Design a protein around this ligand. Structure first.
Ligand SMILES: Nc1nc2c(ncn2[C@@H]2O[C@H](COP(=O)(O)OP(=O)(O)NP(=O)(O)O)[C@@H](O)[C@H]2O)c(=O)[nH]1
Ligand SMILES: [Mg+2]
Lengths: 167, 218
């Protein structure tokens, strides 16, 4: 039983908690209750291997940024989430990767870029631009919708695969 | 604002509460909706246990103050805490977690400010994620000290300069003052200084753009 420790990071309101619960409880949380920190275990089969997913739902608010140093050392893969309707949540991805590579003191950390809320008609972040970012940082880019469950499973499973390649 | 940790069978949930007057039932309600996504009661009902007292159900109508605790176990009524996977010993203790989560929260400290390395003045030092304020506490034979407010973005460092005994410790506060760096020294008991130094350092690892220039100069 291999255990992968996953961490969902990103700016506030981009849907980190909604994606996590969509993976766990398979339904959409319409309320926006800001996260302090939450952990979830899920058992899943990925590419023929049954895996124990340790999921960490972190805070998008900077008031709780002092927690980031603890959860960034222990985590193995990081799900960097922005919302396609929030341009700065996309720009804030730069800060989140820099902190991850700084705390982990490594240049090659399992990571996946996730553009959430792809169901909305108010897109402001280019898929060319987001794809270009992920290519520049050498990580896969997935678009997701916690409302329609689009690519929710793919986003988490890809990060597990990125963790698995790393070892 | 106050924080409690709810431990469940599949993980932990950190919950923010307004105050200790909140009922344990409301805390239960928030934890279940967070753990399960929905407020739906579902077939199994849930109970809250004080972390120190296993297998015992908390009075849901009691206040959070009644419980002299900040960590609770969320357990289904049909099951036991021992059937879960969480309630781990690798997790950071709750008091430290509350300290990290409360860094931006305003808190004032009575400390002594050192001037010219030979004099002291009793000041009350208000610290928050917004600003650090230095104010006197309680005229022909006394001039009061000019009130000083330092915006958090101007702060560069807050370090423990010296620690001699639990009743004596000195820390240094560096900040940007019109393209020049001023240094402030304060003295208090070791416990008070350690809390202040740690509180500001949490704030510093939340902001940027002037500390890096200070560290580049160093
Ligand atoms: N239309 C739509 N709304 C979404 C989607 N994902 C999340 N939301 C909504 O966006 C809001 C914020 O979601 P939430 O998961 O709480 O965000 P977060 O990133 O966890 N916030 P925080 O960092 O404060 O914890 C909620 O109202 C939620 O319903 C999505 O894919 N589509
Ligand atoms: Mg959240």
């Amino acid at each position: 039983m291999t255990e992968y420790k996953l961490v969902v990071v990103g700016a506030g309101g981009v849907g980190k908690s909604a994606l996590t619960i969509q993976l766990i409880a398979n339904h959409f949380v319409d309320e926006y209750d800001p996260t302090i920190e939450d952990s979830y275990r899920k058992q899943v089969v990925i590419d023929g291997e049954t895996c124990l997913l340790d999921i960490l739902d972190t805070a998008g608010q900077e008031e709780y940024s002092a927690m980031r140093d603890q959860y960034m050392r222990t985590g193995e893969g990081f799900l960097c989430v922005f919302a396609i309707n929030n341009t700065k949540s996309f720009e804030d991805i730069h800060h989140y990767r820099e902190q991850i590579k700084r705390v982990k003191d490594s240049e090659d950390v399992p990571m996946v870029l996730v553009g959430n809320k792809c169901d909305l008609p108010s897109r402001t972040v280019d898929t060319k631009q987001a794809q270009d970012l992920a290519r520049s940082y050498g990580i896969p880019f997935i678009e997701t919708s916690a409302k329609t469950r689009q690519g929710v499973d793919d986003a988490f499973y890809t990060l597990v695969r990125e963790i698995r390649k790393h070892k | 604002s106050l924080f409690v940790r709810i431990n469940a069978a599949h993980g932990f949930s950190l919950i923010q509460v307004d105050n200790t007057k909140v009922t344990m039932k409301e805390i239960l309600l928030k934890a279940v909706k967070r753990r399960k996504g929905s407020q739906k009661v579902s077939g199994p009902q849930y109970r809250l246990e004080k972390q120190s007292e296993p297998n015992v159900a908390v009075d849901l109508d009691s206040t959070l103050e009644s419980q002299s605790a900040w960590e609770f176990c969320l357990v289904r009524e049909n099951s036991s805490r021992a059937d879960g996977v969480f309630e781990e010993d690798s997790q950071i203790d709750i008091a430290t977690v509350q300290d990290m989560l409360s860094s931006h929260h305003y808190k004032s400290f009575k400390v002594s400010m050192i001037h010219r390395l030979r004099f002291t003045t009793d000041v009350q030092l208000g610290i928050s994620g917004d600003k650090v304020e230095i104010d006197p506490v309680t005229t022909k034979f006394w001039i009061k000290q000019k009130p000083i407010s330092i915006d958090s973005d101007l702060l560069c460092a807050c370090d423990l300069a010296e620690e001699k005994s639990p009743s004596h410790a000195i820390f240094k506060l560096t900040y940007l003052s019109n393209h020049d760096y001023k240094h402030l020294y304060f003295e208090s008991d070791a416990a008070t200084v350690n809390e202040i130094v740690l509180k500001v350092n949490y704030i510093l690892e939340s902001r940027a753009s002037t500390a890096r220039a200070d560290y580049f100069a160093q």
